[PDB]
Amino acid sequence: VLGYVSDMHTELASISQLVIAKIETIDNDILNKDIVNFIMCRSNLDNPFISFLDTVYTIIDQENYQTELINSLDDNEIIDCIVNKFMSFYKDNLENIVDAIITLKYIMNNPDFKTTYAEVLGSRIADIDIKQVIRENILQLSNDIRERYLG
């Protein structure tokens, strides 16, 4: 659309390499604000991890389906989803963390659920510390995403 030179295999390889090259230059508090902003559809694509997330979101390409699905959920089901996905931030699996962030973005794409839950999500994301889990796992996760979603 705007800003991919080549295919998504190249894009994922290249952006995952940029994340590993730059993740030490990004302060944790700034990383977490950038994650919140991505979830709320105010991406800063200059943060390579947020460019990674945006690329993965685009590759998955399920925004319309997940919107319809999330519309069918009640508040109890959404609370369950939020609590379930949030715990990934405290664990050592990056794939789950990336899934959590993207799921939260889908949920914040629903204006009722954004109104109810955006403040608490912003407050709790501020307390996470995921830089080591990104470092340790991003290259592999890039390969796993290529294998699963691309040709």
Author numbering: 13 to 163
What does the paper say about this structure?
A truncated form of A49 lacking the N-terminal 12 amino acids (A49 Δ12) was thus expressed and purified. It crystallized readily in two distinct conditions, and diffraction data were recorded to 1.8–1.9 Å resolution (A49 Δ12 ammonium sulfate and A49 Δ12 sodium malonate). Residues 13–17 adopt three distinct conformations in the 10 A49 Δ12 molecules observed in the two crystal forms (inset) and are disordered in one of the two molecules of A49 Δ12 per asymmetric unit in crystals grown in the sodium malonate condition. In four of the eight molecules of A49 Δ12 grown in the ammonium sulfate condition and both molecules of A49 Δ12 grown in the sodium malonate condition, a single residue (Gly) of the C-terminal purification tag is observed; in the structure of full-length A49, the final two residues (161 and 162) and the purification tag were not ordered and could not be modeled. Visual inspection of the structures of A49 Δ12 and full-length A49 showed that, in all cases, two molecules of A49 self-associate via an interaction of helices α4 and α6 (the “4-6 face”). In the structure of full-length A49 this interaction is formed by crystallographic 2-fold symmetry, whereas in the structures of A49 Δ12 the interaction is formed by pseudo-2-fold non-crystallographic symmetry. In the structures of A49 Δ12 salt bridges Arg136–Asp92 and Lys103–Asp139 are formed, although these bonds are not symmetric and thus formed only once per pair of A49 molecules. In A49 Δ12 hydrogen bonds are formed between the side chains of Asn88 and Tyr102 and the carbonyl oxygens of Thr128 and Val95, respectively, and between the side chains of Arg136 and Asn96, although again these interactions often occur only once per pair of A49 molecules. Additionally, we observed that A49 crystallized much more readily upon removal of residues 1–12.
VACV protein A49 prevents translocation of NF-κB to the nucleus by sequestering cellular β-TrCP, a protein required for the degradation of the inhibitor of κB. Unexpectedly, the structure showed that A49 possesses a Bcl-2-like fold despite not sharing sequence identity with known cellular or poxvirus Bcl-2 family proteins. Strikingly, despite a lack of sequence conservation with known family members, A49 adopts the Bcl-2 family protein fold comprising five α-helices wrapped around a central helix, α5 (45). The A49 structure shows that A49 lacks a surface groove compatible with binding BH3 peptides and is unable to bind the proapoptotic proteins Bax or Bak.
